[PDB]
Design an enzyme around this catalytic site. Sequence first.
Site, PDB file in Angstrom:
ATOM      1  N   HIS A 113       0.840  -1.206   0.000  1.00 45.38           N
ATOM      2  CA  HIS A 113       0.000   0.000   0.000  1.00 45.38           C
ATOM      3  C   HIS A 113       0.878   1.262   0.000  1.00 45.38           C
ATOM      4  O   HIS A 113       2.029   1.230   0.446  1.00 45.38           O
ATOM      5  CB  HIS A 113      -0.907   0.045   1.255  1.00 45.38           C
ATOM      6  CG  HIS A 113      -1.933  -1.048   1.319  1.00 45.38           C
ATOM      7  ND1 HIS A 113      -3.229  -0.878   0.890  1.00 45.38           N
ATOM      8  CD2 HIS A 113      -1.861  -2.310   1.812  1.00 45.38           C
ATOM      9  CE1 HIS A 113      -3.906  -1.999   1.087  1.00 45.38           C
ATOM     10  NE2 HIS A 113      -3.103  -2.878   1.663  1.00 45.38           N
ATOM     11  N   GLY A 140      12.349 -21.357   8.007  1.00 42.26           N
ATOM     12  CA  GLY A 140      10.943 -21.247   8.351  1.00 42.26           C
ATOM     13  C   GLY A 140      10.599 -19.905   8.981  1.00 42.26           C
ATOM     14  O   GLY A 140      11.433 -19.311   9.640  1.00 42.26           O
ATOM     15  N   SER A 158      16.014 -18.749   9.673  1.00 41.73           N
ATOM     16  CA  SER A 158      14.646 -18.762  10.113  1.00 41.73           C
ATOM     17  C   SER A 158      14.278 -17.435  10.767  1.00 41.73           C
ATOM     18  O   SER A 158      15.095 -16.811  11.424  1.00 41.73           O
ATOM     19  CB  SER A 158      14.373 -19.887  11.130  1.00 41.73           C
ATOM     20  OG  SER A 158      15.345 -19.812  12.147  1.00 41.73           O
ATOM     21  N   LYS A 181      26.840 -13.992   7.327  1.00 44.23           N
ATOM     22  CA  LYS A 181      27.910 -14.868   6.883  1.00 44.23           C
ATOM     23  C   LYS A 181      28.030 -14.791   5.359  1.00 44.23           C
ATOM     24  O   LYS A 181      27.024 -14.743   4.667  1.00 44.23           O
ATOM     25  CB  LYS A 181      27.553 -16.293   7.288  1.00 44.23           C
ATOM     26  CG  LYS A 181      28.699 -17.290   7.335  1.00 44.23           C
ATOM     27  CD  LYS A 181      28.253 -18.565   8.066  1.00 44.23           C
ATOM     28  CE  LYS A 181      28.960 -19.817   7.531  1.00 44.23           C
ATOM     29  NZ  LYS A 181      30.454 -19.731   7.578  1.00 44.23           N
TER      30      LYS A 181
END
Lengths: 184, 184, 184
Positions: A113, A140, A158, A181
């Site tokens: 938006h 994840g 994650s 890294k």
Amino acid sequence: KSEKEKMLAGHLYNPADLELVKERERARRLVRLYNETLETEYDKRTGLLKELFGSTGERLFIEPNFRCDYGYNIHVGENFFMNFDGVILDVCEVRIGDHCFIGPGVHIYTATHPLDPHERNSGLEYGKPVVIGHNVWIGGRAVINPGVTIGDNAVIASGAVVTKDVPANAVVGGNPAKVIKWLK
Amino acid sequence: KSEKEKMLAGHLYNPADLELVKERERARRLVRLYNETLETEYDKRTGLLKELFGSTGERLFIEPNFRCDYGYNIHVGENFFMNFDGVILDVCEVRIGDHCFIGPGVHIYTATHPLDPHERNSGLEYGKPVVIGHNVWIGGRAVINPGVTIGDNAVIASGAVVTKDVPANAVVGGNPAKVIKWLK
Amino acid sequence: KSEKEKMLAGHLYNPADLELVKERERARRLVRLYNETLETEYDKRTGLLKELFGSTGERLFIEPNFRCDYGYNIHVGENFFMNFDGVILDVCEVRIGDHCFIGPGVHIYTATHPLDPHERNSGLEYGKPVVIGHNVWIGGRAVINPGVTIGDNAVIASGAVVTKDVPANAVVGGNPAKVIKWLK
């Protein structure tokens, strides 16, 4: 131009446009049929995904639940895997390379938006495409924001919230994500 | 060693192994039956979980949707509670003590991949167990990464991404989570 | 004072209270019916939400799946939108103003536990209300913590973990979220 043409080009568009609404209902229909498939219905899942997505490689696998906006703006490479409960808001193109491993609860967004409240309340939105390279691992619960390019062989830690481009061969983590890294 | 033995030992293994595939399907089956139960079906829910998990206490309750990889690698203590839309990737053991309260959308991972793209592309994976103490509160939307131990009485703030061990009686928050204060 | 009256007032209360369990069951029934509705059943969805929530404006839309605790504690303003897979733990009031855009996987919490390990082990909980202004955009995967107020026209970046009040006309991001931009 039609609202759909504006949407795809990255311009402000009205989602309430009749053609766009019908296309969203069709994606939601295919997603519903997908999410209802039993855990052993691999061929039927593959079939559904190839009908939903704009393009695929020979094989791909996604754990329910899955969500998307249009379907046809998602293009994935060979041997695509996405774990449980992912969401891909593909208002613009989402293009993903070969051998992608995506963990559970991963969200990839092209939908956005205006920041100005009057501009946002117009009810006009837009999108910025997302590009993910080859041999990418997305941890994840990561969030990939609109407009982001992720290089080949990049690793997304994650939970990382990715707001900028990720260089090839880099590991990123944090919120906002930063290079942690360098692989080489 | 079978692939299952390598998996449980924290060694590299092939998730495409036929035995592991059957076990993953059986877990998804039970999870499917669970997620379909009505909000009033408390006894049926209890029995499903006590069959799904490796071990439990007398009482436990989990709000649908729930997701896991194997089921049998999950061990929970007395009065376990996990709120809506949790994911536990239990390639290796996930051992949780008594009186745990886990908020909604929490992900606990034991599954991981090699960092090197070519090694990752081989399809071989591995795991590292997660251990959670007694009287722990994991706030909504936290991520607990592989190999993490969380001490007794610890609190994980909502949204924390936990990448390293959490001391007993510590509150941690952030991404990566850090100790933000101490208790008791 | 019943457990319900204490819950609503922000005091320690026992969720196992029979009246509260009934109310929680009623909410989940309505949520189950909602989440099963077809993508084309706009009028059915509107009716269900207006039955579930404490108050609404004329128009609202929420993408399944949605989760809440009580329903009646949720009050939304005009043209309310919430994308896929949202969670609102409405132990206390959640008040949201007009023209709110909420991304997918957004969690808004009022439910909380004592931090002190002895107190928490009582099993008793409490809550703190959440107040969200007019013209607010909450990015996907954001977390809004108990007792937070968000001012008019504010923008919560995707993935932001909001632990304290957000000023009107501020953009916040990160974990814990901080002001990253001023609009006015």
